[PDB]
Coordinates of C-alpha atoms and ligand atoms in Angstrom, one line a residue:
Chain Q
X30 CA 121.5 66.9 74.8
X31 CA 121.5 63.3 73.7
X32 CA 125.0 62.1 74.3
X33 CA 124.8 62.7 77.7
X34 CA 121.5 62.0 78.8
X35 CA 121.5 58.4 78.1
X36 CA 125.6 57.7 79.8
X37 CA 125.3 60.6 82.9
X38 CA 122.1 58.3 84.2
X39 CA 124.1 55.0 83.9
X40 CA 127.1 56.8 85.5
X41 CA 125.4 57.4 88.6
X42 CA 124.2 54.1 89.2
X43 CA 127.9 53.6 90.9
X44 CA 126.4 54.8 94.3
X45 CA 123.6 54.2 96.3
X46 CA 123.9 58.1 97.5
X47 CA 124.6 58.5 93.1
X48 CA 121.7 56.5 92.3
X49 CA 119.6 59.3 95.5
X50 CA 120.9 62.2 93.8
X51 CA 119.9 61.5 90.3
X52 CA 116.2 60.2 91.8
X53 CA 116.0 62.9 93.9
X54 CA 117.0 65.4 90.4
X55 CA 114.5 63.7 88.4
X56 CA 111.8 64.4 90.9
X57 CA 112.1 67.9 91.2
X58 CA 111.2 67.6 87.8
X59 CA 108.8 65.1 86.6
X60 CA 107.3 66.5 90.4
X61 CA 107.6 70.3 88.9
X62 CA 105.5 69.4 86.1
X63 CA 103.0 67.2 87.2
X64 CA 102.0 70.3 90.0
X65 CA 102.5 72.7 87.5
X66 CA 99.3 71.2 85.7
X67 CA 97.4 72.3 88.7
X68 CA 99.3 75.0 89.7
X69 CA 100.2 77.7 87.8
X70 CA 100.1 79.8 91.3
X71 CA 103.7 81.4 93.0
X72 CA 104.5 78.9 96.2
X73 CA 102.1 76.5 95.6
X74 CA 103.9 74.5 92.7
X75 CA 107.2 74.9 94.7
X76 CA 106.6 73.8 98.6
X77 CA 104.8 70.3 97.0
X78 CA 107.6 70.0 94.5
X79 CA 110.2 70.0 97.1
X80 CA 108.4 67.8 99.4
X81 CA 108.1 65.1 96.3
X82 CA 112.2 65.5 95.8
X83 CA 112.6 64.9 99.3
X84 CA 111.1 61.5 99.5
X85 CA 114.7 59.6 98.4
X86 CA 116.9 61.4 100.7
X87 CA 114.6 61.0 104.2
X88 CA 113.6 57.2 102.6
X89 CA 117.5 56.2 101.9
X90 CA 119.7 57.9 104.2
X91 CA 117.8 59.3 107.2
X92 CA 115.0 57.0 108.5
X93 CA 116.6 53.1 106.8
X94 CA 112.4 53.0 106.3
X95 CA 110.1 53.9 103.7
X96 CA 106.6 54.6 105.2
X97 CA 108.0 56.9 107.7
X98 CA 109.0 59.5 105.9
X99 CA 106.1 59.3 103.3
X100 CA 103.1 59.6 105.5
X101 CA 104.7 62.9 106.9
X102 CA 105.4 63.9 102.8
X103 CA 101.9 63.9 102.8
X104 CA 101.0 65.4 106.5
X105 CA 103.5 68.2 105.7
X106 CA 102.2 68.8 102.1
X107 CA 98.1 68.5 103.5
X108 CA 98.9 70.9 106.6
X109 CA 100.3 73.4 104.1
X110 CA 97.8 73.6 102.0
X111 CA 95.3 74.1 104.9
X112 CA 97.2 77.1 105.9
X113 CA 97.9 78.3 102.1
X114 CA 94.1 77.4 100.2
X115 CA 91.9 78.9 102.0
X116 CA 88.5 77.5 100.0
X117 CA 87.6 73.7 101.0
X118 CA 86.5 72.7 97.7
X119 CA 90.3 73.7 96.6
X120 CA 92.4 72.3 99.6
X121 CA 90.9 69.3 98.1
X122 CA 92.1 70.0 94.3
X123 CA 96.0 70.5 95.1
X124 CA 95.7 67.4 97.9
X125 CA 94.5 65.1 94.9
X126 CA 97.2 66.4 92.5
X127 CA 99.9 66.2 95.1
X128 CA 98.5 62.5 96.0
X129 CA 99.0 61.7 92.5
X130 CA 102.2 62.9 92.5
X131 CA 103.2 61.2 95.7
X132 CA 102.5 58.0 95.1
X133 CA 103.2 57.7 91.1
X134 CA 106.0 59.8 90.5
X135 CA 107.7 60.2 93.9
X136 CA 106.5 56.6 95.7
X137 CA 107.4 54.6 92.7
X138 CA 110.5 56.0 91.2
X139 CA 112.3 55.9 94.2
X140 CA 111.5 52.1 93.9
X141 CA 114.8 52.2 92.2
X142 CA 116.3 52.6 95.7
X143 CA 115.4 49.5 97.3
X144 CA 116.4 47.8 93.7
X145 CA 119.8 48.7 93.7
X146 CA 119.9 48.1 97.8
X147 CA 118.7 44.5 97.9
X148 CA 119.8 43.3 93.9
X149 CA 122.9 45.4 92.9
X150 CA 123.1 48.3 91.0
X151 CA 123.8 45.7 88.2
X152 CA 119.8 44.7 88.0
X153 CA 119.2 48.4 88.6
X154 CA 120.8 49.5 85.3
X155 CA 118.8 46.5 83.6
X156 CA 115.2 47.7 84.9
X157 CA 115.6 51.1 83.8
X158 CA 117.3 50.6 80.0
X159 CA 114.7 47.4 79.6
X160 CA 112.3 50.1 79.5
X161 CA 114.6 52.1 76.5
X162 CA 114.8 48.8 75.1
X163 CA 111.1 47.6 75.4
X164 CA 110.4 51.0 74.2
X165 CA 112.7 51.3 70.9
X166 CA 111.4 47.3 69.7
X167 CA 107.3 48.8 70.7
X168 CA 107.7 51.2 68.0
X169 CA 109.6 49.4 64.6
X170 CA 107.4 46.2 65.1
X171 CA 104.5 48.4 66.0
X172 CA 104.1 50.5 62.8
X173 CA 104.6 47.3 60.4
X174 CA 102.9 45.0 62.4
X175 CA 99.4 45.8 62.9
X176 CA 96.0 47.6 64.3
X177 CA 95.1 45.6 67.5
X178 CA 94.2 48.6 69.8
X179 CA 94.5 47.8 73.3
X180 CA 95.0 51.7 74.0
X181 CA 92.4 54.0 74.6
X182 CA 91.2 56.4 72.4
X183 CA 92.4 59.6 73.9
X184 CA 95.6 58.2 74.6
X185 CA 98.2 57.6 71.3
X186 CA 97.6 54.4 70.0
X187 CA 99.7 51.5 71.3
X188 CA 99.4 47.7 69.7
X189 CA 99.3 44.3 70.9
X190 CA 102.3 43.4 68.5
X191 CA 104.3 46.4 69.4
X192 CA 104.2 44.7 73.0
X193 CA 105.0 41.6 71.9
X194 CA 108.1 42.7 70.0
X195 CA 109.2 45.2 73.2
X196 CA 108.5 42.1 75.0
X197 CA 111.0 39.9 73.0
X198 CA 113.5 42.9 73.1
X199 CA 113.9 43.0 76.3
X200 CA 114.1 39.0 76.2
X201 CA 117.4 39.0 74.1
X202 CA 118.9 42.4 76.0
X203 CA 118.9 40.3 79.0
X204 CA 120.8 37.1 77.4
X205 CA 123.2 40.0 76.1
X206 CA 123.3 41.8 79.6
X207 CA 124.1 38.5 81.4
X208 CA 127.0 37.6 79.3
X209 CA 128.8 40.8 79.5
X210 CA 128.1 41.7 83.0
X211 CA 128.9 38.2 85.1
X212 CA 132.0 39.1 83.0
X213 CA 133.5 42.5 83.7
X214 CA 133.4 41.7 87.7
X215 CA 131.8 38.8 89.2
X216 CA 128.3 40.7 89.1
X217 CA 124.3 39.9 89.9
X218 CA 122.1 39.5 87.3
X219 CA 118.8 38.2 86.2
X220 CA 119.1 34.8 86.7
X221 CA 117.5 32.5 84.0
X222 CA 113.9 31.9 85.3
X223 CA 113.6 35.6 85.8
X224 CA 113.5 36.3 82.6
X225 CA 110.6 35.6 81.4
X226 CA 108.4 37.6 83.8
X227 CA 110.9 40.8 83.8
X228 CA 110.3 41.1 80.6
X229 CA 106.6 40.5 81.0
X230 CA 106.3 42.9 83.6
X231 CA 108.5 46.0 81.4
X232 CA 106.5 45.2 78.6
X233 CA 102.6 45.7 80.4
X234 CA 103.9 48.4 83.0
X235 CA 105.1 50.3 81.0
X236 CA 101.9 50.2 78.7
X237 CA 100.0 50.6 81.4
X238 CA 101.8 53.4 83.1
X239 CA 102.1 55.4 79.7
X240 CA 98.3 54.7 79.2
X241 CA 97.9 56.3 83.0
X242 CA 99.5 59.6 82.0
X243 CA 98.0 60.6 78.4
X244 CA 94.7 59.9 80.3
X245 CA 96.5 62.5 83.0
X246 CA 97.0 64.6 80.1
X247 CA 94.0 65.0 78.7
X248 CA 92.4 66.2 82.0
X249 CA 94.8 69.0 81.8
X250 CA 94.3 69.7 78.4
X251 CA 97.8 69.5 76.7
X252 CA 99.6 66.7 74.8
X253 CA 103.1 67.2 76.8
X254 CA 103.5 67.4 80.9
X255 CA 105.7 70.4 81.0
X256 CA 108.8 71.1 79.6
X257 CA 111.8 71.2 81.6
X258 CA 114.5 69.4 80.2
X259 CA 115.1 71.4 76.6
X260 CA 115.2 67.7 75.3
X261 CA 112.4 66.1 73.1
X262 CA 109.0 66.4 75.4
X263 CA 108.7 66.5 78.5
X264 CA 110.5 64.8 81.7
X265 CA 107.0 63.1 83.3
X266 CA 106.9 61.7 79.1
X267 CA 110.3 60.1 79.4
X268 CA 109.7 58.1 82.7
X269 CA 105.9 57.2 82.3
X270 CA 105.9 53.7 81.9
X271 CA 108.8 53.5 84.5
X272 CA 106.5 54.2 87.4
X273 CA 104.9 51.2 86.9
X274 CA 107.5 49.2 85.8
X275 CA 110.0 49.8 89.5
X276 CA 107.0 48.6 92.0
X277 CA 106.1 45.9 89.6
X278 CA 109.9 44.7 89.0
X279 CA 111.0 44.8 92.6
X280 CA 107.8 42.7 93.6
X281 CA 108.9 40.3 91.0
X282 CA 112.7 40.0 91.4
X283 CA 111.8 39.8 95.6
X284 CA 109.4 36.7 94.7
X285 CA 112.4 35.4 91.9
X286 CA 115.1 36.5 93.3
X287 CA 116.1 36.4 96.6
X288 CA 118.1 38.9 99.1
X289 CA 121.8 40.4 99.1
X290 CA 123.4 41.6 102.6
Chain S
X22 CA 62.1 52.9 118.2
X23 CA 63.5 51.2 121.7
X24 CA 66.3 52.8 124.1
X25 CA 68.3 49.1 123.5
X26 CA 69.2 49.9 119.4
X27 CA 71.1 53.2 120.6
X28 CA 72.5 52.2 123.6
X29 CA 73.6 48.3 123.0
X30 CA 75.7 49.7 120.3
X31 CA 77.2 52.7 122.3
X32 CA 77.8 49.7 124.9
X33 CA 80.0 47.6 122.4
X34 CA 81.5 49.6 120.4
X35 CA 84.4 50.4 122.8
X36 CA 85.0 46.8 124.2
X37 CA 84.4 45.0 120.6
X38 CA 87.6 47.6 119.3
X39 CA 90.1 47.0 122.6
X40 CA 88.5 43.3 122.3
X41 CA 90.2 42.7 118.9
X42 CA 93.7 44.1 119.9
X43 CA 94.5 40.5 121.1
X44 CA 96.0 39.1 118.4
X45 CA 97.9 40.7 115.6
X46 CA 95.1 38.7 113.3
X47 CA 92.6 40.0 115.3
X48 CA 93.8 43.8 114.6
X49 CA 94.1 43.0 111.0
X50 CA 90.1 42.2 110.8
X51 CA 89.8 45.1 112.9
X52 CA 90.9 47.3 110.5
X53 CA 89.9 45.8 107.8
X54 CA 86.4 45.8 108.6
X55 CA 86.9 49.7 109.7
X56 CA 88.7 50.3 106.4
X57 CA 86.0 48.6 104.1
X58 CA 83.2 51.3 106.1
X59 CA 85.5 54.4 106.0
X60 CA 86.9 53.7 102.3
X61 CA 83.1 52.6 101.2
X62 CA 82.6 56.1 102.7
X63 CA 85.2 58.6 101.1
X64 CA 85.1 56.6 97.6
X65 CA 81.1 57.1 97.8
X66 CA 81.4 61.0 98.0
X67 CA 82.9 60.4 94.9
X68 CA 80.9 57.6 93.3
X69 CA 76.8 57.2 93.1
X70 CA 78.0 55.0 90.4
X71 CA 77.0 51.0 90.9
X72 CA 80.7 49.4 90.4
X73 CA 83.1 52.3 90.6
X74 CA 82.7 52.7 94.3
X75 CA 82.8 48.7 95.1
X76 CA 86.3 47.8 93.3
X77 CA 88.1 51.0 95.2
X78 CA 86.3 49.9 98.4
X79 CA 88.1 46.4 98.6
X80 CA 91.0 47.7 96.9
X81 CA 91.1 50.1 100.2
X82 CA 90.0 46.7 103.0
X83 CA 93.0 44.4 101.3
X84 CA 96.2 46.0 102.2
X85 CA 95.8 45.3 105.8
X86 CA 96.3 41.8 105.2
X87 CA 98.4 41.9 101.8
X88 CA 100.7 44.2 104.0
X89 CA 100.3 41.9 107.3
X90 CA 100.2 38.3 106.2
X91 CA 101.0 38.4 102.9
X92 CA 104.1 40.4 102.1
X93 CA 106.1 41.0 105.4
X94 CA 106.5 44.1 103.8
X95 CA 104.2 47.5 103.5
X96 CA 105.4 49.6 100.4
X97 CA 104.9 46.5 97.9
X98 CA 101.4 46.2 98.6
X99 CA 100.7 49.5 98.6
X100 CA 101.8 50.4 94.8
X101 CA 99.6 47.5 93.6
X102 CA 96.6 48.3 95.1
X103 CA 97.3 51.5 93.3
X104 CA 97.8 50.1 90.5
X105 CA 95.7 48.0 90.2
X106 CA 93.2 51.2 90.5
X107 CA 94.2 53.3 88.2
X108 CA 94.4 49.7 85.6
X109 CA 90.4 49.2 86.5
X110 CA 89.7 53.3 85.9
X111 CA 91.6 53.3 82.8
X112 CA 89.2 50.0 81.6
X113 CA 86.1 51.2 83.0
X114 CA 85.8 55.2 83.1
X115 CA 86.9 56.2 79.5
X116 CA 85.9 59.5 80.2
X117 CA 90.2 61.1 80.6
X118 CA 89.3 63.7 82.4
X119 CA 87.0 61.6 84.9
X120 CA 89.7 58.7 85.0
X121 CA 91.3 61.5 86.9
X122 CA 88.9 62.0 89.1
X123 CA 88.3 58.5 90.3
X124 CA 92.2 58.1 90.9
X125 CA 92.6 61.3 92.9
X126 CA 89.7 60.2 95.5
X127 CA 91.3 56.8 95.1
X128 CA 94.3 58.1 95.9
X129 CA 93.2 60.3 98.8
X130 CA 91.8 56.9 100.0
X131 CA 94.2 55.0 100.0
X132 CA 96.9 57.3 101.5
X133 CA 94.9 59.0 104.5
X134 CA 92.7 56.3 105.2
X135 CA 94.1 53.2 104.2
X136 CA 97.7 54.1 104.6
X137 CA 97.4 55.9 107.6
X138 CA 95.0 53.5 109.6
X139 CA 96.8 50.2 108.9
X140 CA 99.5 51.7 110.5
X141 CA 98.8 50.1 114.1
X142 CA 99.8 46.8 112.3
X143 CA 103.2 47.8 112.5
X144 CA 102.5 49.8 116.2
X145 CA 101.3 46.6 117.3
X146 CA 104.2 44.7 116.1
X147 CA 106.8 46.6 117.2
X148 CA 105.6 47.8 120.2
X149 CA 103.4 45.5 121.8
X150 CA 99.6 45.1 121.3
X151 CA 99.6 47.3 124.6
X152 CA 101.2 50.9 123.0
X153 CA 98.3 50.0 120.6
X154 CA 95.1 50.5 122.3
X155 CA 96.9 53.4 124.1
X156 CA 97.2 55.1 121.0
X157 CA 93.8 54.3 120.1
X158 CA 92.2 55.3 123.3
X159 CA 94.2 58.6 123.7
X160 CA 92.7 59.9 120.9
X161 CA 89.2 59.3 123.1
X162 CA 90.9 60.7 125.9
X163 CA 92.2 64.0 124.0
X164 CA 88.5 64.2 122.4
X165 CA 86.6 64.3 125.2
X166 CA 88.9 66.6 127.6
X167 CA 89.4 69.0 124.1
X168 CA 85.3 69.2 124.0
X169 CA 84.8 70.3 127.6
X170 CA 88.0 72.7 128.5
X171 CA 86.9 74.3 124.7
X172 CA 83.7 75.0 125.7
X173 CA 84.0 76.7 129.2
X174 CA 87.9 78.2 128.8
X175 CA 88.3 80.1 125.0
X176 CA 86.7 81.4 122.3
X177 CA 90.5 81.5 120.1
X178 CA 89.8 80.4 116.6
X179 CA 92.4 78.2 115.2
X180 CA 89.8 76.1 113.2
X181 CA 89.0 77.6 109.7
X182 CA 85.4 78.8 108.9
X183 CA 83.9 75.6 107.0
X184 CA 85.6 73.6 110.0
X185 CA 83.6 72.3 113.4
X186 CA 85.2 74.4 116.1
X187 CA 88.6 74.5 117.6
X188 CA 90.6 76.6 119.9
X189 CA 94.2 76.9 121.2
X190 CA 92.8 76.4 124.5
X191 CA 91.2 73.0 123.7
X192 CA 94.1 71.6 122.5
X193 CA 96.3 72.4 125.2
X194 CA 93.3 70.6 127.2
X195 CA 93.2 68.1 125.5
X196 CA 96.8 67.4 125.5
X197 CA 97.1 67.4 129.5
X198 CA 94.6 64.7 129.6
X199 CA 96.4 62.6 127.3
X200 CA 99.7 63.6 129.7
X201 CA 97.6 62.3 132.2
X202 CA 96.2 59.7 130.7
X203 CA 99.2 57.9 130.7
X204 CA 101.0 57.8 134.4
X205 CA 97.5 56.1 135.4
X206 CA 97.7 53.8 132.2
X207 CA 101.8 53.1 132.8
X208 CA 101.1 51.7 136.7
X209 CA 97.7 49.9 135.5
X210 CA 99.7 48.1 132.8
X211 CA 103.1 47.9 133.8
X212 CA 101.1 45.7 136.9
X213 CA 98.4 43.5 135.3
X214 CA 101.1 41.8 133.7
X215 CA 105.0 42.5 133.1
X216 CA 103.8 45.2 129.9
X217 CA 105.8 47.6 127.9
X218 CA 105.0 51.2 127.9
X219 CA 105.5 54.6 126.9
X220 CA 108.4 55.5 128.9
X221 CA 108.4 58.9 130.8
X222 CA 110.3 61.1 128.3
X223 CA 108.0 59.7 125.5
X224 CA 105.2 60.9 127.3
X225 CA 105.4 64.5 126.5
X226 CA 105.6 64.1 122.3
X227 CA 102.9 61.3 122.4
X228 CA 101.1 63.8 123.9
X229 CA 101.6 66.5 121.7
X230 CA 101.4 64.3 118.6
X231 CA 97.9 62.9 119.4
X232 CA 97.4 66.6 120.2
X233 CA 98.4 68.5 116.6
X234 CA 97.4 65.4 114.7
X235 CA 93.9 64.9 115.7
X236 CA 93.0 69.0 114.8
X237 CA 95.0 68.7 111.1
X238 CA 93.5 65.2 110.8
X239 CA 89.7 66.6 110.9
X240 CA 90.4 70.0 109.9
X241 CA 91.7 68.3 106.6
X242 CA 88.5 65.8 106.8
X243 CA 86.1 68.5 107.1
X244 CA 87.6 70.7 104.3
X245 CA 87.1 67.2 102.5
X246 CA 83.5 67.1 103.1
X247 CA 82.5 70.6 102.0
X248 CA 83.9 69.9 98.6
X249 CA 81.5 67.0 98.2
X250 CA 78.5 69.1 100.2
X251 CA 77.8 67.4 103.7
X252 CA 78.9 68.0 106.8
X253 CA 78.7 64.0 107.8
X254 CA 81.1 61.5 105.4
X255 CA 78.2 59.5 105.5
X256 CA 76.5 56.6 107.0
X257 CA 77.5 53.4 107.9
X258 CA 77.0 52.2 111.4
X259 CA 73.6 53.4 113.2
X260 CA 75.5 55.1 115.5
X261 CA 76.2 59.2 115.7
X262 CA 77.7 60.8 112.9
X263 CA 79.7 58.7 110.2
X264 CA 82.6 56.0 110.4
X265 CA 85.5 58.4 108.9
X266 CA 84.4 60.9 110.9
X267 CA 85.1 59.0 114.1
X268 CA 88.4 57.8 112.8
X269 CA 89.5 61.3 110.6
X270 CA 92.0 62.7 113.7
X271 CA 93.3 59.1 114.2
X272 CA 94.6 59.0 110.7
X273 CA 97.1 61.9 111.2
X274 CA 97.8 60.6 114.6
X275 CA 99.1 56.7 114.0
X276 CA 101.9 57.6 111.3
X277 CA 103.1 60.5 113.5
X278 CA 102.8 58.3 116.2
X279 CA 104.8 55.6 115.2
X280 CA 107.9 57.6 113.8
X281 CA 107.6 59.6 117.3
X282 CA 107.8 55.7 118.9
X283 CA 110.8 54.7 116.6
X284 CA 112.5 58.2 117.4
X285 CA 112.2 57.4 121.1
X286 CA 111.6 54.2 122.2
X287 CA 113.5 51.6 119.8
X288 CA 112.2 48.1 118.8
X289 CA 110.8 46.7 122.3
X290 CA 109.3 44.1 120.4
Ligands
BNG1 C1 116.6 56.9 88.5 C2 116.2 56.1 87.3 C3 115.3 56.8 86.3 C4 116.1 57.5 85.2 C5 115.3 58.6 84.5 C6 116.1 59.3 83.5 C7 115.3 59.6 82.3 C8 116.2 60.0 81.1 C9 115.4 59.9 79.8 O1 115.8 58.8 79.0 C10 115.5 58.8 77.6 O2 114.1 58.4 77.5 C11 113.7 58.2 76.1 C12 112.2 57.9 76.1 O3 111.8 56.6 76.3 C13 114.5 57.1 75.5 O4 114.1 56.8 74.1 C14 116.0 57.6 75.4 O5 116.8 56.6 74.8 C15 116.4 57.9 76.9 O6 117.8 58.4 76.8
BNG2 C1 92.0 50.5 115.1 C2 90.9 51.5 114.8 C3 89.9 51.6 115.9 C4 88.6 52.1 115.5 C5 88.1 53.2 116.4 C6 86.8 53.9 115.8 C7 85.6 53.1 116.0 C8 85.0 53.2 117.4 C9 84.3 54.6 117.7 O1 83.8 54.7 119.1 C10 83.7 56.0 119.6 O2 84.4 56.9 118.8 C11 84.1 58.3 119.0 C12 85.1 59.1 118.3 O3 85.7 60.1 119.1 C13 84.0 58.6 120.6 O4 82.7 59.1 120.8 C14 84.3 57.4 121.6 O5 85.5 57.7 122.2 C15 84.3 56.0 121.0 O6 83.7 55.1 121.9
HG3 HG1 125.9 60.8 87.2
HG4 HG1 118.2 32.9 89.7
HG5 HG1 86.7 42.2 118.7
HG6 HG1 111.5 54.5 129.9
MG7 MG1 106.5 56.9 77.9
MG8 MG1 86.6 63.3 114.4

């Protein structure tokens, strides 16, 4: 399991049509489970699941646009579930699930897509592991540091401190990353003034989108989202905080950062 | 009780709309002022709460201009508005099973309505403020021509049974007059003034589109409706029925429209 998981993703951040592939993997799964939870019916799950995988190949490769192939993601899914459910108050249950799943899982994962386009697949790499590394640094200075709650109290406790550490680990990754990466090839990174904020952003979103989930969870009754990967929980648990992190990183790298060819 | 409060706003209503699609500022306000009705609307079926439904609502009315003026850009926008959602549901509803709740009629909202309707910014844009009120209008067009050929030529159900009534045969109405619709809205414009138009091999999809799109786009409103009881979304304007019911076929329509538009016609800005 674990010797892989963590080197097979980096490897594929060599291509754009690598970086599609593994996006398009991981949302058959995160996307599997997050139906699932409303579905535990034959086709349903399956038709909406493929639809949410779908999303990086038509939004890379065959329309050079995003909103495109989305809006008809969602037409597609909202037509089949007219034909399939045939009780209103229903139609209306798997259209709010799928929504979810559209816009949080599918919508902003594939953010990584645009990342890589317009900021190398350099800054790519960094946005996803920042989130490892925030995540590692929330925990160790979270249990010796202190009770601050700032989560909620269904979801598992998270601490101002443990943020503030995460936040400061991903601070010092970056001075790290910089050096080693404007070295092996005459690569993009984070500039300086970018910093700051990156880390910012990795440390709330991924708070935030963590926070998002367990509340998810809870409405569904369980303490995992599924298991598909015979790893340690489940594969919606491992990129949580990653949703909002993507959106919230490209937004700020765009308004830091600039534009490559 | 006077015969001016009924008619003065039947008399308006369609030259205030094809009034506004002068400027690409003016469409904005357009739809934003249509978005803050419609999402006040769907976010109330959800909400009798005081707050709840008021943050979503502006939430909904902002991307319009966030995604016009603000960002040149639609997608970046869009995930902070959602976020910025689900951030307020989290502080306010502490209920876990209810946060849910709020985010998937959220959600709903901002997709289908939202989404979907601030899509003539970019139809506008790229394809001249004319293709944009012939979108608009065509969905009038199909309406009208789907109501009378339905009533005097078919009794084939294609509409489910919690759904208004549709047939095979009012579509296929419907879509003729949108057909036709257009050779007598190609000479009009492409003489007033030197106007782009839906070219003659666009003609036929266009049609179709507006066809398929306004039946899924109220078939999926109505189903909408009966989960939260009423057979109107609810009242806004004084006028007849409720705001995203005269909108709900429009929504399905403008997305499909403008890939159908990229498809065939390029960027004729
Ligand atoms: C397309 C970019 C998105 C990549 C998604 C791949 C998810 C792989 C799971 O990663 C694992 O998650 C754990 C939980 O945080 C870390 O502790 C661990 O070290 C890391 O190996
Ligand atoms: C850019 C979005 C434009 C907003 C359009 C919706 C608001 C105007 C509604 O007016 C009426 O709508 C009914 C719906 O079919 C018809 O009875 C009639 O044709 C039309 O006069
Ligand atoms: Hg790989
Ligand atoms: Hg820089
Ligand atoms: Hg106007
Ligand atoms: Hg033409
Ligand atoms: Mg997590
Ligand atoms: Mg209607």
């Amino acid at each position: 399991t674990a010797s892989v998981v963590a080197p097979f993703v980096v490897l594929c951040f060599v291509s754009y049509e690598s970086l599609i592939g593994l996006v398009s993997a991981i949302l058959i799964l995160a996307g599997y489970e997050l139906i699932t939870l409303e579905m535990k019916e034959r086709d349903a799950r399956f038709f909406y699941v493929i639809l949410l995988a779908l999303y990086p190949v038509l939004y890379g490769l065959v329309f050079e646009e995003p909103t495109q192939p989305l809006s008809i993601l969602f037409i597609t899914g909202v037509v089949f579930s007219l034909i399939t459910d045939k009780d209103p108050s229903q139609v209306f249950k798997t259209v709010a699930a799928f929504s979810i799943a559209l816009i949080y899982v599918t919508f902003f994962l594939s953010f990584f897509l645009p990342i890589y386009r317009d900021f190398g697949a350099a800054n790519a790499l960094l946005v996803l592991t920042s989130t490892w590394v925030f995540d590692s640094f929330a925990y160790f200075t979270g249990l010796k540091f202190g009770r601050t709650r700032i989560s909620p109290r269904y979801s598992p406790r998270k601490s101002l401190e443990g943020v503030i550490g995460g936040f400061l680990g991903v601070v010092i990754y970056t001075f790290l990353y910089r050096l080693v990466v404007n070295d092996l090839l005459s690569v993009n990174v984070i500039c300086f003034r970018t910093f700051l904020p990156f880390a910012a952003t990795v440390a709330i979103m991924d708070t935030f989108g963590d926070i998002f989930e367990s509340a998810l969870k809870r409405h569904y009754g369980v303490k995992d989202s599924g298991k598909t990967l015979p790893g340690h929980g489940g594969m919606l648990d491992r990129i949580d905080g990653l949703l909002f992190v993507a959106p919230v990183c490209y937004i700020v790298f765009k308004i830091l950062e600039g534009v490559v060819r």
